[PDB]
Swiss-Prot record:
The function of this hydrophobic plant seed protein is not known. InterPro entries: Thionin, Thionin-like_sf. It holds the Pfam family Thionin. Its main location: secreted. This is Crambin. GO terms for cellular component: extracellular region. It comes from Crambe hispanica subsp. abyssinica (Abyssinian kale). Two isoforms exists, a major form PL (shown here) and a minor form SI. It comes from the Eukaryota. Changing P22S: In isoform SI. One of its GO terms (biological process) is defense response.
């Protein structure tokens, strides 16, 4: 599951993913994170 720290960070993550870029590279590029669970914490609410 991906969790993003702000709305802008999530919009940038979605554009990063359009050509197929792996999630791990889009995560360090945007500040979003990847967790094994399904429940994002409150400071990664977007």
């Amino acid at each position: 599951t991906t969790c993003c720290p702000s709305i802008v960070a999530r919009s940038n993550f979605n554009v990063c993913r359009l050509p197929g870029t792996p999630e791990a590279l889009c995560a360090t590029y945007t500040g979003c994170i990847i967790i094994p669970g399904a429940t994002c914490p409150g400071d990664y609410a977007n």
